Amino acid sequence: ATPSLRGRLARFGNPRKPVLKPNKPLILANRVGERRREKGEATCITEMSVMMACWKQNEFRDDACRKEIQGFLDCAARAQEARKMRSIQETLGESGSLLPNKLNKLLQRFPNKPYL
Amino acid sequence: ATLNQMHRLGPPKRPPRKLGPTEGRPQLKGVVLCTFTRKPKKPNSANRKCCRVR
Amino acid sequence: PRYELALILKAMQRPETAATLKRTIEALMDRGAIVRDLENLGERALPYRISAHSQQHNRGGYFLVDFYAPTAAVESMVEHLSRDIDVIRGNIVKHPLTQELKECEGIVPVPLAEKLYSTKKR
Amino acid sequence: AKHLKFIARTVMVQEGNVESAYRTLNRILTMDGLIEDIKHRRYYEKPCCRRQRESYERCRRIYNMEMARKINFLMRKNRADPWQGC
Amino acid sequence: DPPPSTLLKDYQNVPGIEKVDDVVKRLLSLEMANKKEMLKIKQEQFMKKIVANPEDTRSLEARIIALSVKIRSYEEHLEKHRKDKAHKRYLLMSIDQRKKMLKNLRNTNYDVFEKICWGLGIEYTFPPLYYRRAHRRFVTKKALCIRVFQETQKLKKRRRALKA
Amino acid sequence: HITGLCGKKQKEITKAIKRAQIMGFMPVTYKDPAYLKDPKVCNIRYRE
Amino acid sequence: KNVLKIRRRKMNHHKYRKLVKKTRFLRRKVQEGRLRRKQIKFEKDLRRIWLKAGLKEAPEGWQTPKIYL
RNA sequence: CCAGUUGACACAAAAUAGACUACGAAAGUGGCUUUAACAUAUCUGAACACACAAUAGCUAAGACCCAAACUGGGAUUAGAUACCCCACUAUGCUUAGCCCUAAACCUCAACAGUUCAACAAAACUGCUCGCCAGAACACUACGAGCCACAGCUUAAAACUCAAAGGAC
RNA sequence: UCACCAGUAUUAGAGGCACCGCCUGCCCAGUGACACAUGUUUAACGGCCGCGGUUAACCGUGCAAAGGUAGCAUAAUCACUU
Ligand SMILES: [Mg+2]
Ligand SMILES: [Mg+2]
Ligand SMILES: [Mg+2]
Ligand SMILES: [Mg+2]
Ligand SMILES: [Mg+2]
Ligand SMILES: [Mg+2]
Ligand SMILES: [Mg+2]
Ligand SMILES: [Mg+2]
Ligand SMILES: [Mg+2]
Ligand SMILES: [Mg+2]
Ligand SMILES: [Mg+2]
Ligand SMILES: [Mg+2]
Ligand SMILES: [Zn+2]
Secondary structure: OOOOOHHHOOOOOOOOOOOOOOOOOOOOOOOOOOOOOOOOOOOOOHHHHHHHHHHHHOOOOOOOOHHHHHHHHHHHHHHHHHHHHHHHHOOOOOOOOOOHHHHHHHHHHOOOOOOO | OOHHHHHHHOOOOOOOOOOOOOOOOOOOOOOEEEEEEOOOOOOOOOOOEEEEEO | OOEEEEOEOOOOOHHHHHHHHHHHHHHHHHOOOOOOOEEEOOOEEEEEEEEOOOOEEEEEOOEEEEEOOOOOOHHHHHHHHHHOOOOOEOOOEEOOOOOOOOOOOOOOOOOOOOOOOOOOOO | OOOOOOOOOOOOOOOOOHHHHHHHHHHHHHHHOOHHHHHHHOOOOOHHHHHHHHHHHHHHHHHHHHHHHHHHHHOOOOOOOOOOOO | OOOOOOOOOHHHHOOOOOOOOHHHHHHOOHHHOOHHHHHHHHHHHHHHHOOOOOOOOOOHHHHHHHHHHHHHHHHHHHHOOOOOHHHHHHHHHHHHHHHHHHHHHHHHOOHHHHHHHHHHOOOOOOOOOOOOOOOHHHHHHHHHHHHHHHHHHHHHHHHHHHOO | OOOOOOHHHHHHHHHHHHHHHHHOOOOOOOOOHHHOOOOOOOOOOOOO | OOOOHHHHHHHHHHHHHHHHHHOOHHHHHHHHHHHHHHHHHHHHHHHHHHHHOOOOOOOOOOOOOOOOO
């Protein structure tokens, strides 16, 4: 629920203290916050670990650790496919938040009127 | 301000002024002692003369 | 004024608890009070393994000894309680029913911002 | 120390899906209000900086609540061309 | 300074406690009362002793008595824990208000003012004119001036007595 | 915001909670297990 | 606004601090001399008062101690 | 004698409520209990006065988890006496004394009442205490006063200026 | 258990300086004392630098412990010195 906010700004009638000192005016802007994207995460951790364990048990031959290297390559291909799917969905469907353009146009249809 | 403060302080005052020659002397009679030279400030540039008069 | 003793004891048998209650009541009466009521929540489990000079126990009661002690005696009674060994702890708070409740009627409709910025086209 | 050992913050797990229990514990900690507390306790927060942080947090929270209310109120208009007159 | 056995003010009007269980009579006593009850009892006693119109709480006499009782309470408080300087400021402001009220009463009535002064006991001392804030230098200067005045007075007396 | 109490009522409730925590009538770092039979009073966001 | 007045004030304060640090013993000597001159002036004023206050030779039994230790 | 469970376990403060405007003349003050209580049912009224007053620094009284200026080193640039790290002296503290500063700024004075130069908190009506009407010099010298001796309150004078300054 | 002692770390013994005020800045290469797991101690013995430059800062530097910090000044302070 919207909390109180009367006795928080430094105003004429207000005889209290300014517990809330906003650095900018509280005016609902016609834009919305942008959704973050991209992050150096480097996926494929479980397959990397199992491949490292296999290579430690054996040496470096591809015919020995085939059971693990095949899964590692499959997981790498799946990660590439997931990256491509995310890049595609960035323009089709956004997960979590909605397209900022929708709210931008909605506010453009009925913008703010603070200056009367 | 209020009238009480203006009454306690009072109207302003007209202080005097004084140039170099005290007692009001627009035309003085000095004696020359030196005839050195001096240059102006940064913008202006010259080598005008400057005498040490008493 | 009225007061209430939040006596918190352990599961230290019946006669020992009775003797401690008698001692506390005698002290309260000597301080100039009048016994109002005597209640207790039974020697049940404690909210956490607490020490009481100086063993750990997990089973203790919450005896309530109401009284009408004077004004300048609460700190002395708290110090006396802290001095006791069998008593775990307990802050003597005034009677709760004595505080006349201020008749409130739910939340009121808080209005929106009542003018906070100038009127300029900017 | 003087409190019971294994009772609280005991998010059980099952079905070999620790990610679900991990997210549940994360949500619990976030709703309780201690992750940010520990993150700020990583170093000493000056009283001036602490008050500034609290003020900024309150302001951002009020703004976010107002924006959420406005969105919940104005999400109705999302058709396309109902009139087509112009 | 009422005795520690008298009943309260609001409880004395009703006769329900005058003839009731001894526990209630013992609980509703000054010994078991609070500071506000003692203050009210003292105010009532002073009003009945000095003020000829009791239960006023509007004129200047009742207000002056209340201010004096408040100043006494502030003094009793500042007795222990003197570091509380906010209470000292409140005490100074209350003393100033009491002085103003006494001045107003004296300007309005002189006989009643003298009666109140004799009753309460607060002497009416004139306030110091100027607050030049004397210092060590000025103090010793004034002392030397007084000494020189006495010496020159004695010298003039001797000179006058010289003529036989 | 989630509980939905008034100023005075919430203040009294939290004061009583703190008094019980200090004196020793309620666990501080957890909830009393001997009194769990409580209907859904608050909107427990966690656990849905 | 810009912090120019206050920055210049702080610079002047730092210059004064450097001045006091580089030289302070001569300042203390000048202060001692000023205190001595003030004491001498006070004694002369007391003597003038004694002379112009009718009687002379200064009242007996009085002492004029020196202030400032 | 370091990292992880448990057992006798900090003279500093309380997290979610802190998504509350609460109390004070100001700084300021929120885990609980208490000894007392916040003048004015006419207002303003002293920086010739009375009460004081964030932190800052000092003399003793013990040291603390942590940090602790200057310090020792490590990689560092021609140079680091700083930006990363480890420990510490006075110190962040109370038990006894102080000095009397602030971006003490919400830089919007108190009392009763009404519907704009620009940033900001739109204008004011009647009354009252204090201050100013150029900048560096000038949180200064000289005076005066102070338990303060490299300190603090008011506080200038000659010279230079064509200026200093706030908003967009 | 003859004093130091019929005393006990705020108590005694061996030393440097000179009450009170501002201060006691740097250095264990060398000697001494600490086995302090290789380091401490300079209020211990002792020491706090040179060459060329627009009457000097700052440059190029060599060596170690620092290279005289504050302060006072023709000194009871090597002729210069009257
Ligand atoms: Mg105080
Ligand atoms: Mg700005
Ligand atoms: Mg403390
Ligand atoms: Mg102040
Ligand atoms: Mg530490
Ligand atoms: Mg340093
Ligand atoms: Mg320390
Ligand atoms: Mg402030
Ligand atoms: Mg006034
Ligand atoms: Mg003023
Ligand atoms: Mg030395
Ligand atoms: Mg010589
Ligand atoms: Zn409530």
